Nucleic acid binder design. Sequence first.
DNA 1: ATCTACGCGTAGATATATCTACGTTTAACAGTGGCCTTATTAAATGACTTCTCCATGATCTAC
Length: 54
Amino acid sequence: RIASTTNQSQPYHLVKLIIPVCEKAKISVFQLFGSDFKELGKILFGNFSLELKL
DNA sequence: ATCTACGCGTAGATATATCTACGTTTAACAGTGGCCTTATTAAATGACTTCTCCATGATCTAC
């Protein structure tokens, strides 16, 4: 939330923020930076067993 | 390799930034009826101290 409230052009701390975030999301860094928004959303919804569909 | 200067990493101190949100029921009522025990009985039996312990003087009798 802080990273999304601060200026978006500001870089994010890799090991401090992104790697733990994708870790808790059960998502590889490759999947996060490579897949499009549709695939990422579908995989996130399946990972947390949500019923959403983007 | 060594002396000297300087730019940087870093730790400490400090000001800042954090979007929704609002409106959160207005109305009218908060039982109207009637009763609030009718009968009957208000004990029937028998017992209501049980006992001593008397006071005083005439008389008998022993020393």
